[PDB]
Amino acid sequence: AFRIEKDTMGEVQVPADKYWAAQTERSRNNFKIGPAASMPHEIIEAFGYLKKAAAFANTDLGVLPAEKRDLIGQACDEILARKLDDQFPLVIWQTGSGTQSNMNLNEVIANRAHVINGGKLGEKSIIHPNDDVNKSQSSNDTYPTAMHIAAYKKVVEATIPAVERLQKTLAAKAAEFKDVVKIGRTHLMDATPLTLGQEFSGYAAQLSFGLTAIKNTLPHLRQLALGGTAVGTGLNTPKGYDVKVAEYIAKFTGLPFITAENKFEALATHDAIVETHGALKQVAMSLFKIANDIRLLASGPRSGIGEILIPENEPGCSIMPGKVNPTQCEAMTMVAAQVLGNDTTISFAGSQGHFELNVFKPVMAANFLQSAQLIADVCISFDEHCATGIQPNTPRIQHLLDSSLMLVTALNTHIGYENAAKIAKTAHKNGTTLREEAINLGLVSAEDFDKWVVPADMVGSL
Amino acid sequence: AFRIEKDTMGEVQVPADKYWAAQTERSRNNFKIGPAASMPHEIIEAFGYLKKAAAFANTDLGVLPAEKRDLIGQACDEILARKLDDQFPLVIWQTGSGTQSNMNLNEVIANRAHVINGGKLGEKSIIHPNDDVNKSQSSNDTYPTAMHIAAYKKVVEATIPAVERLQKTLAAKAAEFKDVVKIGRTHLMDATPLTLGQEFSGYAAQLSFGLTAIKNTLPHLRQLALGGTAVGTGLNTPKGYDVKVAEYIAKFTGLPFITAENKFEALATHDAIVETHGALKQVAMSLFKIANDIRLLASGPRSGIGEILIPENEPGCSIMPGKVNPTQCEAMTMVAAQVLGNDTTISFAGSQGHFELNVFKPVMAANFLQSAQLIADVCISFDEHCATGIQPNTPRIQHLLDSSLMLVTALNTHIGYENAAKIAKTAHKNGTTLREEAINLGLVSAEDFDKWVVPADMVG
Amino acid sequence: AFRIEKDTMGEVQVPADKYWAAQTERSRNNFKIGPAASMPHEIIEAFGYLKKAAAFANTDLGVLPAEKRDLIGQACDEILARKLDDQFPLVIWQTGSGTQSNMNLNEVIANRAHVINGGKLGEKSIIHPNDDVNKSQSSNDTYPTAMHIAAYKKVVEATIPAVERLQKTLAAKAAEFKDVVKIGRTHLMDATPLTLGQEFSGYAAQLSFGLTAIKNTLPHLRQLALGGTAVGTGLNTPKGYDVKVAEYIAKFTGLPFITAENKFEALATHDAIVETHGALKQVAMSLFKIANDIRLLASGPRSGIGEILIPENEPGCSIMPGKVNPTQCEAMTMVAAQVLGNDTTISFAGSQGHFELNVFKPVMAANFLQSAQLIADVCISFDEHCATGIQPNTPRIQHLLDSSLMLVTALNTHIGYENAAKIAKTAHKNGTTLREEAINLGLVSAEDFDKWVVPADMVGSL
Amino acid sequence: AFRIEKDTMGEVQVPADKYWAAQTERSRNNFKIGPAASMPHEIIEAFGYLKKAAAFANTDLGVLPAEKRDLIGQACDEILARKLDDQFPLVIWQTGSGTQSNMNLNEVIANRAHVINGGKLGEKSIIHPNDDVNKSQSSNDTYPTAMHIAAYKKVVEATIPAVERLQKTLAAKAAEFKDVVKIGRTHLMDATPLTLGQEFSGYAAQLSFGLTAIKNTLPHLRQLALGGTAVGTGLNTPKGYDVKVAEYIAKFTGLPFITAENKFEALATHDAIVETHGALKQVAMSLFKIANDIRLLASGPRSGIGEILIPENEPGCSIMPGKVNPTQCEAMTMVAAQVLGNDTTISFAGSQGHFELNVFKPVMAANFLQSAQLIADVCISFDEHCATGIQPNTPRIQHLLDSSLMLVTALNTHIGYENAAKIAKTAHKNGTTLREEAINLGLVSAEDFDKWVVPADMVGSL
């Protein structure tokens, strides 16, 4: 059962129960692309915040009756309270401006406002979608404003806290293991010693530089397009609208949003989305290396490296009974792979602005929100289910430490490089110890070898 | 309300009405990454087919009783018939083998078989998840089989016919517009004439080459890992299982699946996924250009090219009243940018196999199906709501054709490049016509100009 | 010292001894971007062939006098014999059509033909760069023609032989190692057995599939734009020129070139470059894996896996004396990482056609030829200096084989998954053997265990 | 001709007159991959600065005699004055550590030092390449140090100044065209007016945001690995060496380099190269969009947009006489396509560290330096030959603007969206002005229309 709704193109049958109208219904039917309602909820939420703000600003500046503000406000509160989730059926793969999702908001607010005020759904709303709910706005400044609200919110409320969480565990493990001496590997080959603490201090430092790099991008990301309207000029905005609607968004979200310095840059590009996503990819490449190291170190438990123990959360294998695998490592490496591809998509799209508008907005927003959410989720999963539980396998570490022929490196400043190399080659060829061959070649006394080749004194300077 | 299921790690509380067991539930709780149940339904379907196939093969080779085959068979039928979708809650971002989704089928199939046979959830299944439903199988060979079944089925039944549909529209437009003489543009600058039909024949040709590139990758994609089990060796497989189970998958799917030539290549790599997705990315880069040319050609009405007219499907703009946008073009360019990204992800994951197993299966699987589906969807949408409706802007085409100073190129073989170059530069600097300056420079008679410079004669 | 050359835009000081003229000199001065003369020689060599074929076709079809054909052929023969390599100073980062490089061929051929014929540099050439050397031609068809010649030549003469050679070594090793039983690793954890032969047969299969995938893309790539001229219409070409010039190029190169089926596709895209480079990229990603497995398999010699011994070609380390690294594996992984980003560049540029011409020709050409050359060079280097010399570390393989608790998988069909899991978990927890704990649990007798748990019998069907 | 040099692996025939030794010759022969001597000159230069710094630090802390420092500094001073370019024959695609290039420096410094001291090639060098030139160093800390010196130097001396120079032209253009009203385009369709100045202000803003994003990465980039040695522990360094060698590098370069906070991160990753290249790729995608806009705006000159005039630097076309193309825009869009690809390679290699060492150092070095150099060179080129000469085509701007039906947007706040859409659709169907139809539909008076619809007032707020 459908009712008739109208736009400036003609009449459309709209499902009789739904708060949306003609332009929403056209979009729902004209873009059967991927799964239904794929436009991210975070973008709808951000729309709820900015549409409330536009109404509060427009009232303060004298161009919208308080009555209309109050009704738009209450409708926006209901969107924000996840009361109207089923009134947003549009996909990412629509018009590249997000005009159709902007009109999905305008139409649902107008009709929901009509019913709140005691009207019948289907009757001309007391609130006009374009003239009232969209007053002083474009899809061109609202959709970018929704993008930066959702993006900033997800980065500062989910992603950075989740990455800080893992960073703190890695630094905690660096201190916890500060006295466990293990063998270095370079090129996958036996190297000189370092503590398991030092190894983990690398991982902790990678995420600290990652957090800094993301934080460096937030000033650009907090700038909002709202007030540039169609082409950036602020056509049909009241004087002072730009600064005042930003203040309202800042106050509703509790986050430090300002009006964009340049509305042309803010419509014609998503450079801020590229800058922040670049930082998300940097952390993601770091996380890949960290998770890869942890699975290498935990490999075995008999025929691999086996230097660390990790929590055993589930049966690893349907055919190999008793197998346990590093599954959180794998989930982390898979997300990191996802973020690299998302970075290609965002980078490509970010180049493809024409004149006064970039019309890759939905695809940039969906890819950015996915990276930001998945990095958050997997950092929490990995910390809870792997990183907090990492412990050293003491005897395996000792066996692999005492084994390295490259312990010989401690004799470099005593007998020089060429003589140290003779010892290592000779031990290697003969299947003997460094100590045996240092003595046999008469290059070092038993005494001096035992004084000089001490792993625990090789993990700092002279 | 929960009930106790057991795995070889101990007891787990399971939602008492759900057909899954200990291992599904651990995964559901341990992998809270992205939206719930993100594992593609195409993979769950692929699993329905191969789990049925496994059971039928195992009974044929003497290692599974018929009674147990029929119960597994029935449960798989219900999975294919979309009766058990709520029984599959696991995410892409699980173990990189897909072990947890393989154990999701094994556990669901076993418990549902018990109930089909007259049992109750909460009792020991007459069918063992591992010894019976997972007989002669590993996560390592079933999950890549699922991947190829799903990938091959999406490409031949959805992606190719959608691309074929748009290709024939573009060829039909190339013939319909064969007599429409328009100006060519190179470097975005005015050039020599071609027909609109000729321009459209380039787009038609692009998707025909793209259709061949995709078809070339099908022989590798049609090959299935099933029979390699743990490491590629076929450990715990009966002799002849590899070929027999491929035949049942072929039969059940109606599609030409064969056993993989090398089960070690089939487990350690997803080079078939990289091969076929490179071809989807080729088609996507073509589609981007076509979609971009079409919105360039339709740009205006005043401030652009405006050489074609496109269907006007919806109001373009919440603030600019009456504006109409090439919105199907923009959906097609946004899909193409997604697929390029999906190619970076798949290529990177494809490189990261270790020893006997590539454990990036689900992210490669998810990114593949997304590219295949969205290319399918956007080609149908674009054909329906744009390509089928394109028509020339007849007066606009003639105005822009007759205005090109690079019509002077017709004079090359008569007066040489240098003399031709003087006519076009004098016309441009004086804001006059080629003809007026050919006469004022004394390089061409009026009568020779009119004979030699005929746009219709410059299109071959 | 300079001389004056002229183009349609005015007078230019040209280095007095060089055979290029005004347009080549303008491009050399106006595009100071990266190293001088970066335009690949393979593109100049392709231009040498197609310029000769164009002169020959033009005379056969009555529009170029034989005398001018002969002088052009001789200048073109000098370019192909590498006698004029210093006459091409233009960069990749010029006009997106490669117009400047086409005019570099036209100017050099014209001025060289003039001197061959007895004239001097500084005089007006008896052969006009545009009217004669460029007759029946555009940059828009010559440059893509140069790209396909250079690419197809490089793929069939260098890339495919290189990969075939390494494929054959890997097939040989598969046969040589067919009876060497080693432990499989899944998720990096101890799995069930396979032969070192089986593992290597995987590597051999990956490169056969990759060769098939490159070869599938050749039919598209052997199609030449030559004949489309300015926009694809073949304006200013005599009837039959497209087929005739393709035949001369087939003959001069000895490679199966044909005229493009659609000259609009041949000018407005380089989808054939995108098609073939995606196959090169497929191969690069397979090579990454093979190279990474081999260094993983060689790791140690005590702290790693160390199942294979590889050729030791040089000292590994300036500070760690006697260290030897898998350096060929590293070159292969680094090239694979280069090819993936080359594919990002080619795809992006692939999408960015406008109307009748794609003007990213040089960046596509350079990235393609680099990938094809590097893949060939590293497969040859890796075959000679690593793959040919790989041998098993037999005793290390035996140790790592016998220590795997997942040998218990052989018991699945005898006692079940749950009973087999009990044995492996008990062995793990106790630091004991499968065999001990199989007897200890009354699950399996000595005799049956010794019968059923045979690694040599776990590398095939039941 | 040859002489014998020796390494810990044996005797090598070295070209008699070359200052390199056994390890450089091995590498030269063992890695025949891509053109000869591909390792960037900037990496060798960086090595020059750091080897001299190491020698001075080593003397100050009493572990190298002043006499040996003086010789190392003299050989280092010959590398830095570009006198020994022919002594560095090694390729990018070597060992993934850059070991062979580290030993190339050590060998050439040793032997050139020996000859400077009055010795002869073929003699044992007075200075040992491992014990003296490489004292208190690994390849694992010197190669990353070379990379950061090279990367930091290139970005702040070439890339930032080039980008700043172009930004300043786009800002001067924004101010020069502040009063020129032109038609907006959104989705490539007629939109509302903005000034040509406001449009250029977007371009200027993009480069300003890009410059800030690049500078935010400099703090991480100026950290040097030097002092970490083999695995990061500073094994075989004297106390204070890390800090003191950083001061010498800062002194000799004149740039504020500091010792890395975490030497394990400085060896096991190139996260700082990922961080800075991300910012470079941001600026490239911005430059792509700017260059594409300028070529769209300049297109025609009679059957495109044609709103702006760009300088005419060369004949555009070999067949179409008098054609002139936007060739500098093309060079910039191709470089941008190159940098995006470079970002993929760098991101991939950045993820692929194992344990204590990332062994993709050369490929990350080469791709970084290419991006930084090409972005500098094309920004200077585009500025000099394109952007400084951009002028309005005033009559053509007015022609395309006065036309626009979306000037109707000025009526929204007076009559509402639905009435404004009637006017626009009726003018469109009838091919009449907005004014005629506004009056004729009885929706707006002549007086009110002329008052409310003023293009010049549509470039700002109500």
What is the phi-psi region of residue B111: left when phi exceeds 0, alpha when psi lies from -120 to 50, beta otherwise? alpha
Please count the other Cβ atoms lying within 10 Å of the Cβ belonging to residue D462: 14
Residue D292: exposure state from Cβ atoms within 10 A (0-12, 13-18, ≥19): buried
Residue C431: exposure state from Cβ atoms within 10 A (0-12, 13-18, ≥19): exposed
Closest CA relative to residue A249, chosen from A236, A259, A263 = A259
DSSP readout, D187-242? TTEEEEEEEHHHHHHHHHHHHHHHHHHHHHTHHHHTEE-TT-TTTSS-TT--TTHH
User: Which DSSP state fits A96?
Assistant: T
Q: Beta strand pairing status for D189-195 and D181-186?
A: antiparallel
- The residue written with tokens 């016998």 in the block is C402
Question: Hey, where are the domains in chain D?
Answer: 3-138, 139-406, 407-458
The answer to whether the CB atoms of A345 and B341 lie below 8 A apart is: yes
> CA–CA separation, D438 vs D436, rounded Å?
6
DSSP readout, B263-296? HHHHHH--HHHHHHHHHHHHHHHHHHHHHHHHHH
Q: Note the resolution in Å, 1 decimal.
A: 2.1
Closest CA relative to residue A317, chosen from B352, B151, B357, B64 = B357
Cβ-nearest to D322 among B320, B322, B421: B421
> CA–CA separation, B341 vs B345, rounded Å?
6
Contact B352, A292 (CB under 8 A): no
- Separation of first and last alpha carbons in chain C: 84
Residues present in chain A in total: 462
Alpha-carbon distances, residue C276 vs B371, C151, C152, C272 (angstroms): 20, 9, 9, 6
Reduced to 3 states (helix: H, G, I; strand: E, B; else coil), residue D166 is helix
> CA–CA separation, C362 vs D66, rounded Å?
52
**Angle (nearest 5°) at CA A176 between A175 and A178:** 60
Alpha-carbon distances, residue C73 vs B236, C43, C80 (angstroms): 69, 17, 10
- The residue written with tokens 């699987």 in the block is B365
- Which residues, 6 or more positions from C176, have their beta carbon under 8 angstroms from its beta carbon? C197
C-facing residues of A in 401-460 (CB < 8 A) are 403-406, 408-409, 412, 417-418, 420-421, 423-425, 428
Please count the other Cβ atoms lying within 10 Å of the Cβ belonging to residue D63: 16
Partners of B319 on chain D (C-beta within 8 Å) are 409, 412, 417
Closest CA relative to residue C315, chosen from D229, D93, D22 = D22
- Which residues, 6 or more positions from A251, have their beta carbon under 8 angstroms from its beta carbon? none
Please count the other Cβ atoms lying within 10 Å of the Cβ belonging to residue D127: 25
Cβ-nearest to C321 among A188, A191, A408: A408
> E-assigned strands of D225-326?
258-259, 308-309
> CA–CA separation, B406 vs D338, rounded Å?
32
Reduced to 3 states (helix: H, G, I; strand: E, B; else coil), residue C397 is helix
> CA–CA separation, C17 vs C19, rounded Å?
7
Residue A201 corresponds to which amino acid? S
Largest CA distance in chain D: 103
Q: String of b and e for D256-282 (b: at least 16 CB within 10 Å)?
A: ebebbebbbbbbbbbbbbbbbbbbbbb
Task: Write down the experimental method used for this entry.
Answer: X-ray
Reduced to 3 states (helix: H, G, I; strand: E, B; else coil), residue B1 is coil
Alpha-carbon distances, residue B160 vs A162, B155, B201, B211, B280 (angstroms): 42, 6, 19, 7, 10
The answer to whether the CB atoms of C337 and D349 lie below 8 A apart is: yes
Interface probe for A, chosen from D132, D135, D351, D409 (most Cβ of A below 10 Å), is: D351
Partners of B63 on chain C (C-beta within 8 Å) are 413
> CA–CA separation, C255 vs C174, rounded Å?
34
- Which residues, 6 or more positions from D157, have their beta carbon under 8 angstroms from its beta carbon? none
- Which residues, 6 or more positions from B192, have their beta carbon under 8 angstroms from its beta carbon? B183, B184, B404, B406, B407, B409, B410, B458, C230, C231, C233, C235, D320
Half-sphere exposure of B279 (CA within 13 A, CB side): 30
Reduced to 3 states (helix: H, G, I; strand: E, B; else coil), residue A272 is helix
Partners of D36 on chain C (C-beta within 8 Å) are none
For C399, the closest chain A residue by CA position comes to A303
Contact D366, D270 (CB under 8 A): no
Closest CA relative to residue A159, chosen from A211, A216, A221 = A211
The answer to whether the CB atoms of B237 and C462 lie below 8 A apart is: yes
DSSP readout, D59-81? HHTTSS-HHHHHHHHHHHHHHHT
Contact C405, C427 (CB under 8 A): yes
> CA–CA separation, B33 vs B51, rounded Å?
27
Please count the other Cβ atoms lying within 10 Å of the Cβ belonging to residue C273: 27
Largest CA distance in chain C: 103
Q: Where are the alpha helices (DSSP H) in C155-195?
A: 160-176
Residues present in chain C in total: 462
> CA–CA separation, D273 vs A207, rounded Å?
15
Cβ-nearest to C350 among B188, B268, B285: B285
Interface probe for B, chosen from A31, A314, A339 (most Cβ of B below 10 Å), is: A314
> CA–CA separation, B312 vs B327, rounded Å?
9
> CA–CA separation, A336 vs A437, rounded Å?
47
Q: At what angle do helices A41-60 and A241-253 cross, to 10 degrees?
A: 130
DSSP readout, C190-241? EEEEEEHHHHHHHHHHHHHHHHHHHHHTHHHHTEE-TT-TTTSS-TT--TTH
Q: Which tokens belong to A210?
A: 């990652």
- Which residues, 6 or more positions from C79, have their beta carbon under 8 angstroms from its beta carbon? C44, C45, C47, C48, C51, C105, C108, C109
Residue D351 corresponds to which amino acid? S
Q: Which tokens belong to D301?
A: 């000159």
- Which residues, 6 or more positions from C272, have their beta carbon under 8 angstroms from its beta carbon? B209, C148, C217, C220, C221, C223
Reduced to 3 states (helix: H, G, I; strand: E, B; else coil), residue D402 is helix
For B315, the closest chain D residue by CA position comes to D421
- The residue written with tokens 């003039």 in the block is C114
Closest CA relative to residue D243, chosen from D268, D222, D262, D260 = D260
Q: Beta strand pairing status for A258-259 and A223-224?
A: parallel
Contact D129, D54 (CB under 8 A): no
Q: Which tokens belong to C19?
A: 């055979």
Residue B242 corresponds to which amino acid? D
Q: Which tokens belong to B96?
A: 């990189």
> E-assigned strands of B296-442?
308-309, 391-392
Alpha-carbon distances, residue C450 vs A77, C406, C427, C447 (angstroms): 72, 15, 16, 5
Residue B157: exposure state from Cβ atoms within 10 A (0-12, 13-18, ≥19): middle
Contact C166, C118 (CB under 8 A): no
User: Which DSSP state fits C16?
Assistant: T
CA distance C81 to chain B (A): 30
Q: String of b and e for C196-213 (b: at least 16 CB within 10 Å)?
A: bbbbbbbbbbbbbbbbeb
Contact B262, C194 (CB under 8 A): no
**Angle (nearest 5°) at CA D243 between D239 and D244:** 85
Largest CA distance in chain B: 103
Q: What are phi and psi of C7, to 5 degrees?
A: -125, -175
Closest CA relative to residue C149, chosen from C47, C77, C242 = C47
> CA–CA separation, B446 vs B423, rounded Å?
13
Interface probe for A, chosen from C183, C189, C407 (most Cβ of A below 10 Å), is: C189
B334: contact with A, CB 8 A cutoff: yes
Q: C3 has which bridge partners?
A: C14
Q: String of b and e for A343-361 (b: at least 16 CB within 10 Å)?
A: bbbbbbbbbbbbbbbbbbb
> CA–CA separation, D397 vs D308, rounded Å?
8
**Angle (nearest 5°) at CA A212 between A206 and A215:** 140
Residues present in chain B in total: 460
Contact D349, C336 (CB under 8 A): no
Please give the distance of CA C358 from its chain centroid, rounded to a whole number: 22
Rounded-to-10 torsion of CA B239, B245, B250, B252 = 150
- The residue written with tokens 């079809």 in the block is C61
B314: contact with A, CB 8 A cutoff: yes
- Separation of first and last alpha carbons in chain D: 84
For B343, the closest chain A residue by CA position comes to A341
Residue B454: exposure state from Cβ atoms within 10 A (0-12, 13-18, ≥19): exposed
- The residue written with tokens 């080749």 in the block is A453
Partners of D227 on chain C (C-beta within 8 Å) are none
DSSP readout, B400-425? HHHH-GGGGGGGHHHH-HHHHHHHHH
Partners of C300 on chain A (C-beta within 8 Å) are 189-190
What is the C-alpha radius of gyration for chain A, rounded to an integer number of angstroms?
30
Rounded-to-10 torsion of CA C71, C75, C77, C83 = 150
> CA–CA separation, B177 vs B194, rounded Å?
11
Residue A162: exposure state from Cβ atoms within 10 A (0-12, 13-18, ≥19): buried
Please count the other Cβ atoms lying within 10 Å of the Cβ belonging to residue D35: 11
